[PDB]
RNA sequence: AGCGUACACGGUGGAUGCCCUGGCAGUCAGAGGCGAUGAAGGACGUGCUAAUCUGCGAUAAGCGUCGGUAAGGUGAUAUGAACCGUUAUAACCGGCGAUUUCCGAAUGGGGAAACCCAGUGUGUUUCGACACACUAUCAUUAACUGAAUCCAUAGGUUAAUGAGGCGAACCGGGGGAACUGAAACAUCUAAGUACCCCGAGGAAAAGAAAUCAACCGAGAUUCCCCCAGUAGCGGCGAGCGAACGGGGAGCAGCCCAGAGCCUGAAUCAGUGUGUGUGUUAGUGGAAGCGUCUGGAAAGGCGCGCGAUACAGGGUGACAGCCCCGUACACAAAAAUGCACAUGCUGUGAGCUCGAUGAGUAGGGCGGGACACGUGGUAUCCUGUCUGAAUAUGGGGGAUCCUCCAAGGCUAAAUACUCCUGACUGACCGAUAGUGAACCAGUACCGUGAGGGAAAGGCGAAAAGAACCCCGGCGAGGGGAGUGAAAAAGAACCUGAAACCGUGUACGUACAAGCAGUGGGAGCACGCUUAGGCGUGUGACUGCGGUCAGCGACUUAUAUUCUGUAGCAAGGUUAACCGAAUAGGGGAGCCGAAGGGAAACCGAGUCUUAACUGGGCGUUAAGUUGCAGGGUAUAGACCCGAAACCCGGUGAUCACCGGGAGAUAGCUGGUUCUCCCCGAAAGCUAUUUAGGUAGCGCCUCGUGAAUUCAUCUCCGGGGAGAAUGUUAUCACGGGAGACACACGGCGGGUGCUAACGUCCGUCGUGAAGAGGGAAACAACCCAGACCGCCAGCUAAGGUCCCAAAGUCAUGGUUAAGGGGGCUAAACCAUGCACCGAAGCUGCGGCAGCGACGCUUAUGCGUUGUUGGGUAGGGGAGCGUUCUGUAAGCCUGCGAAGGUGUGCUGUGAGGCAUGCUGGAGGUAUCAGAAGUGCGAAUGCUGACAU
């Protein structure tokens, strides 16, 4: 996960981190709150997956 | 004098002013304490009322007798050292050399070595004549004794011309070898 | 590294437990260890009808240093002190008295 | 047989507090109880609690005979100020 | 060893009976409280009252010699006057004088039993005669 | 039978048996010494003393052992002027049983 | 170097005050008062040993006068008696003899009435 | 043995500590002088204006000496070329 | 020759310097002592000068 | 608003002396430098 | 009914004992800056979060790559839920990077700090918004525009660079006080100190003679030790302070001045390569079992083993062999410092001639300011003109000596620590050390600068009390259970005193003035088999604001003396080097010769022309360390003012920091024991009334004639007996007193009174206790070494109070502290007795002299002495720490708390019961933050 999506291009990664964050991050706080998601490992789990496809796609494309 | 060798039955001519003049105890104590007054690190230091933090007069609360307040007589960082006559420690090790040859804490041998630097042959060695927490003074210092001796703790081991006064008292036997003995006889003259 | 791990079978040195052997479970962060059936307390559990509360007295397993635990090895049957040494690629602990590899 | 029971850190001054436990000792407790009943001194409640507390652990802790226990060993203390509390014991036994 | 100490609990005492015809009052009273104070018997202590009781008959008969009978004042009457209507109280005050100040003094001086009249209730209690 | 003797400036009347206290005297404990001195002898008709230091009466006495007093302190200073000294002292001392007195 | 003399100074005032005990409240409880009687106490233990002597001097005087006036005889005059008798008997034995036994006290002043004249 | 070592009678004295208790107490600079003991033997040390300040006796610029005697006179040291004190001809002489 | 006998009676405590002297000289350092004397002028002096506080037998 | 005004942040690091006040409460270590 | 006493059992209290994740003081190395590419310091967010610390910044306890390591891990409080990983993509560590909200120099504008409001350019677009960059000033460079002024310039614009601010000391420069002291203004010191401002630095500054000196000579700057606290300056007073020269660490002198000869020649800084050596993670790393106590062994007991590892830490009590470690041997993908040979860009090896610094010095002319006013007056500059030759000449001190300025640079030794790593400590251990060991510059106080605390400990492991009961579904508690211990329960190690309580035994209720001491019954408990014995109380009787802690003569430099040790006419090193407490270093200082105004002489020496003058020395040994007693200077044994100045904060009606531990004067306090001796409040001159310089009394060590005192005689000092521990004199150290009171005697003055005055005799007290006159410092007796339930006495007394004569021999007397006495008063005598801490009797201790055992003690003795304020001398106890000491005691019980017994003249010491539950320390030496009963002392608690 961390190194097999390096070679991807830059709009696809551009793609996979707008559906990533746009969904995920919105479903897993509103869940959150809500009561439900009695896990919360999905929770750092996105944000840390996010925060990796952010530290690429700057230096992949030279920002 | 005649020091017996112990291994040759051969005598070593050390003259009657260097190991055998008389015990002077007030010297050897004189100069005992200023060797141990020497090793003395003055290093300490109090907060006099001018020192601790704090300001106004409302008397004042930096005096002695409040509570926090400064000593009254703080210390500072001082040198302990005291001045030793070269003639003074010379006669002293010489009066130690003489004590030591009466009360036959002082033995000599022909050559103290050891053929590799393990501790445990130093310590067969020892055991053979019978000593425990000796100091071993020699000439030209060996490595393989020196590494040796290190670790064993009643055991010392230094060279001719690192004696103290100290040094040949807090031990109970010495072990100059012949060599040493010589060099000791020139440094003391 | 660290000369105890999951599942080696350990011989209590000392601490009320002399000789009694075990088998490790866990291994603390803080230098604790946690054997099968060494040291036993008696803990008074507040009641909780949630949680699964297992119920009364729970007679459960503490910790204990582990330099009380000596690893015990089948061949002499005596405890004995445990070393590292380098295999053709790899590291592995290997037994004093005769260096009886694990 | 002896049966202790006090309260510490009492929300009261100690002298108030001795003033009505000096009424009830070397009394039996079957007095002791209904003199504390009709007492209107506020410590009073404060004694009437302890002592049936007292009562309490004597009963669950022994067999039984309620009846002849007595007021043998009961004294204010001071307590820690803040208004000083006061640590008030009661020993009931039956000899 | 140590001095004997009289006990009180097993001080012994006898009565005494001193009639005061014809004697002086100061001599009469100092001898009356020389054998209140016990000083007499060889057993004196001078914490305990091991005196004895002693009565006094016919104190009406008490003879002063010189102009006494006018300068003696008690507390303002005069002498005749007192020893008319109380012939007690002029013994009993020397007496008085004639005593350490405080309650053991005043527990001694209790002993003393003054009348005028010879007759007295105490007869039963076998009063020996004394000479004065 | 009671005998007067003195022994150390003070003289001690002592009756048969009973032990007395005396001050320190240079004695072995074992020794039993004889005391030349007595003043009075008491008996039915008791016999006076017709001459200081009567001859005719001897006091036999056993030493049993020798010690010091209790404990005194001593303050020899006086006048308070804000001053201590409390010195101790403990006098010597010998006990002694009397056997045997002659008339 | 530092010392703390708070070991020193709680046992020297402990071994003050373990001799004031029972003066009445503070003098046995406060020591800058406890001092100041244990020293008056002192004092007067001084001043008593001496006085002791005076003390039992007059009684045993007293006791030997009241003895000899029961035999007819004043104190002075049997004291005369019994030096010119060349008697030894000390004031403390003649008190003892005289509040003992009577017969003794008798002989006693017999003896000194047949040497007075 | 240093538990045996011990200071002589007197040496060392406590001190003592006031406030405590009260039971406790409380041409002319270069003129100089030539003693029989200098230059007594100084291997060549022959009376002369030079060969004095080598020998390290008296200063090192002095340039006028004496032949003054404070006793100890022991070397018949012979002095010519130099001021003599007439006191001088009794004891180097003799 | 004959020797008398000197005895002291009375104290010195108040007493001029001169009579503490005579009294240190006759040998009288203690009141009731007594000590012997020969017999000369001076020791009649002696005596004399101080006759109210010492007894000669 | 008159203790703004005066003793405020702004205004204290107008002037030298208020900077100099200001060095010397961060050098104490202060929790609030000014207010 | 209460109160007091002793014991037992409890509570608040948090002292004491043990401990350290905290400080203090230093050594060795690194480093000495950070920031518009956005600093120091903050606000707000971020985890599954109710809160804090730490990390981090909308990629928010983390993201990418590369290495080490890996079977555990997701930071902690303080756990839980939910999850990842286990043999190479869990997590952890390090190198290299990406992200890095807002305030803050803040910089797009505004503003009340973390807030509000805009323009331009670009990307995106749900064609609404969103996403990134720029938008403050000055200075410099290139270019375009560009008025006064045709060109050109000032200015504007574009492209590029530097500063803006923060930070502890050190360096340079510019400003810059006051208090105070010198006999007193001035003057100096205070002090270029306190404090303010600008600058680069890792060090800075300075650095190579137009210097000194004297006819011999040193040769850059800076620093260290001597010279020397000397010469000198100074109302010659406080105080200030040299140079030459000598010994040391470093030692480096160069470039241009303008040309020539072969060239670019060595070296230098930059720019790359390869190796080694480190830094930033890391790997391996020796060798114990049985037994006895014990909760547990690492402790005792026995036998083994390792040691180039017995430095250290943890582990159920003290571990070389249990674990981490140490010695030693190895390790780097990446970044980085140093040392080399290497391609390359620039100053370019070496010789010759010039040059030797010119509108410059000098000449001046007038000012100002350097503290320096023409005063003893030196110094910088010009508003201004002139202006000399280049070694043959010029400058400085006629000869002589030294240099070549008016051009420039120069590491080394040298000062400090904001910070980083290691180590050390006769440094502290919660009232100490920092203000802060803990959520401290916090709580809190003031609008403000600023001021500014209290607060540590359960247990080995939370095993942190399931369960039952009282209570209000509380607080609190009693059982059960865990635990060695709950006499460890979260208010948690030890747990004293004041203070407040329950029980037991005893005593006691009108105002005394002490509730102590000697005697001492009685009452309760244990003895004893009775003897009047111990403990608890004390009828009767003689005499008569509190607790615990903290807190005070120390340290440095000079000088004098004493004791002690080495060497000895020699002694002795400083800086520095150093195999670093050794050894080297003799540069330096003291003495050995003094006399003499100097000169001069010299074991001899001078004055006067020389002395009938007396010399001054040698014959006595000085020097260097150690400890101590004094003196002076620094704050100077400790605490205690008003005032003046500087830098700031408030004028809502002066306050904060510093000079400053200011300076006076005058009170207050100054902590353990014992022994011996033991004062004074008096005199001379000065007297700037501050006092001063002496005399006088005291003590200690030495020397001295046997000195002095008393009594006798002689003469107006001499002689003679004995006694007095030399009580006599001199020298040297150290003192205290230097305002004395009362009274008899001889006074002057005078009430011919004096406690008004100062004298000689003095006695009492100060500094002397006791007896008597009722008490009473001034009246009499009398000088307390300690004990005795012994005796004899002095003053005074013998009727009772109150121990002793109602004694005797003769008279007088009716006057009447208490009763009273006709003698129980006054005048005489005699025998007696009482009468003190006086004397004697027994016992015991200590000081000082002589004779005989021992020659330090210990004895026959001999005797004598032993009140004591200030003061002097001597001998001791106690506590912390260091060596002895990896030895000894100690879990069979340490330190501490609390009782008892024994012991010492006492400071104190030993043993032991209970509590305590792990340290303590012998003997001998060494260093003190060393001994508390008060300073309107401080802190906490307890009272009122």
Not at chain 8, 54 to 77: C, D, H, R, S, Y
């Amino acid at each position: 996960m961390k190194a097999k999506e390096l070679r991807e291009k830059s709009v696809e990664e551009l793609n996979t981190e707008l559906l990533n964050l746009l969904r995920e991050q919105f479903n897993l706080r509103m869940q959150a709150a809500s009561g439900q998601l009695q896990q919360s490992h999905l929770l750092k789990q996105v944000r840390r997956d996010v925060a990796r496809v952010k530290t690429l796609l700057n230096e992949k494309a030279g920002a | 004098m005649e020091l017996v060798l112990k291994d040759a039955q051969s005598a070593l001519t050390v003259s009657e002013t260097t190991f055998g003049r008389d015990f002077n105890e007030a010297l050897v104590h004189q100069v005992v304490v200023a060797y141990a007054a020497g090793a003395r690190q003055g290093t300490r230091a109090q907060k006099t009322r001018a020192e601790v933090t704090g300001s106004g007069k409302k008397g004042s609360i930096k005096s002695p007798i409040w509570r926090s307040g400064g000593v009254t007589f703080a210390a500072r960082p001082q040198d302990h050292s005291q001045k030793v006559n070269k003639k003074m420690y010379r006669g002293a090790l010489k009066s130690i050399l003489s004590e030591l040859v009466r009360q036959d804490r002082l033995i000599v041998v022909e050559k103290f070595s050891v053929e590799a630097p393990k501790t445990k042959l130093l310590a067969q060695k020892l055991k053979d004549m019978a000593l425990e927490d000796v100091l071993i003074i020699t000439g030209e210092l060996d490595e393989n004794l020196f590494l040796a001796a290190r670790n064993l703790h009643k055991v010392d081991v230094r060279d001719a011309t690192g004696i103290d006064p100290v040094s040949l008292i807090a031990f109970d036997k010495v072990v100059m070898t012949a060599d040493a003995v010589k060099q000791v006889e020139e440094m003391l003259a | 590294a660290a000369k105890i791990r999951r599942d080696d079978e350990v011989i209590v040195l000392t601490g009320k437990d002399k000789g009694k052997r075990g088998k490790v479970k866990n291994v603390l962060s803080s230098g604790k260890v946690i054997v099968e059936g060494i040291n036993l307390v008696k803990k008074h559990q507040k009641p909780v009808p949630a949680l699964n509360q297992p119920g009364g007295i729970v007679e459960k397993e503490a910790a204990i240093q582990v330099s009380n635990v000596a690893i015990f090895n089948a061949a002499t049957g005596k405890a004995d002190r445990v070393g590292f040494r380098f295999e053709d690629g790899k590291k592995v602990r290997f037994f004093k008295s005769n260096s009886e590899t694990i | 047989m002896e049966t202790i029971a006090k309260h510490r850190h009492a929300r009261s001054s100690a002298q108030k507090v001795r003033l009505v436990a000096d009424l009830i000792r070397g009394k039996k407790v079957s007095q002791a109880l209904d003199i504390l009943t009709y007492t209107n001194k506020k410590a009073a409640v404060l004694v009437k609690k302890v002592l049936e507390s007292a009562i309490a652990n004597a009963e669950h802790n022994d067999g039984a005979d309620i009846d002849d226990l007595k007021v043998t060993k009961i004294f204010v203390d001071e307590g820690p100020s803040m208004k000083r509390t006061s640590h008030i014991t009661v020993v009931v036994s039956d000899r | 060893m140590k001095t004997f100490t009289a006990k009180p609990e097993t001080v012994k005492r006898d009565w005494y009976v001193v009639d005061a015809t014809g004697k002086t009052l100061g001599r009469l009273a100092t001898e009356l409280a020389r054998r209140l104070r016990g000083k007499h018997k060889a057993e004196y202590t001078p914490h305990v009252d091991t005196g004895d009781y002693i009565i006094v008959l016919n104190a009406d008969k008490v003879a002063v010699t010189g102009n006494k009978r006018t300068d003696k004042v008690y507390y303002q009457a005069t002498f005749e006057e007192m020893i008319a209507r109380r012939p007690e109280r002029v013994i009993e005050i020397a007496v008085k004088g004639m005593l350490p100040k405080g309650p053991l003094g005043r527990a001694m001086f209790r002993k003393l039993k003054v009348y005028a009249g010879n007759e007295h209730n105490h007869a039963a209690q076998q009063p020996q005669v004394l000479d004065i | 039978m009671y005998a007067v003797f003195q022994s150390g400036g003070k003289q001690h009347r002592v009756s048969e048996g009973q032990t007395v206290r005396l001050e320190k005297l240079d004695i072995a404990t074992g020794e039993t010494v004889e005391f030349a001195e007595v003043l009075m002898i008491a008996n039915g008709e008791e016999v006076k003393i017709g001459v200081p230091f009567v001859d005719g009466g001897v006091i036999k006495a056993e030493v049993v052992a020798h010690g010091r007093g209790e404990k005194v302190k001593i303050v020899k200073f006086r006048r308070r002027k804000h001053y201590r000294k409390q010195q101790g002292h403990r006098q010597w001392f010998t006990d002694v049983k009397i056997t045997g007195i002659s008339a | 170097a530092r010392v703390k003399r708070g070991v020193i100074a709680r046992a020297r005032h402990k071994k003050i005050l373990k001799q004031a005990k029972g003066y009445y409240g503070a003098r046995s409880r406060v020591y800058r008062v406890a001092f100041q009687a244990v020293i008056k106490a002192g004092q007067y233990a001084y001043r008593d040993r001496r006085q002791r002597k005076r003390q039992f001097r007059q009684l045993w005087i007293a006791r030997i006068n009241a003895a000899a006036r029961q035999n007819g005889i004043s104190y002075s005059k049997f004291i005369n008696g019994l030096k010119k008798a060349s008697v030894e008997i000390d004031r403390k034995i003649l008190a003892d003899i005289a509040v003992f036994d009577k017969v003794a006290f008798t002989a006693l002043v017999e003896k000194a009435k047949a040497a007075l004249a | 043995r240093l538990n045996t070592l011990s200071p002589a009678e007197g040496s060392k004295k406590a001190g003592k500590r006031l406030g405590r208790g009260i039971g406790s107490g409380l041409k002319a600079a270069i003129t100089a002088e030539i003693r029989l003991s200098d230059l007594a033997k100084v291997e060549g040390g022959v009376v002369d204006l030079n060969t004095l300040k080598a020998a390290n006796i008296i200063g090192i610029q002095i340039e006028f000496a004496k032949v003054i005697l404070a006793g100890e006179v022991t070397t018949p040291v012979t002095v010519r070329g130099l001021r003599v004190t007439k006191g001088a001809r009794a004891a180097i002489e003799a | 020759a004959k020797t008398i006998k000197i005895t002291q009676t009375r104290s010195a405590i108040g007493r001029l310097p001169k009579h503490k002297a005579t009294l240190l000289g006759l040998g009288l350092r203690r009141i009731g002592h007594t000590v012997e004397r020969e017999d000369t002028p001076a020791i009649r002096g002696m005596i004399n000068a101080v006759s109210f506080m010492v007894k000669v037998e | 608003l008159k203790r703004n005004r005066s003793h405020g942040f702004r205004a204290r690091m107008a002037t030298k002396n208020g900077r100099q006040v200001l060095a010397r409460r961060r050098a104490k270590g202060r929790a609030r430098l000014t207010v």
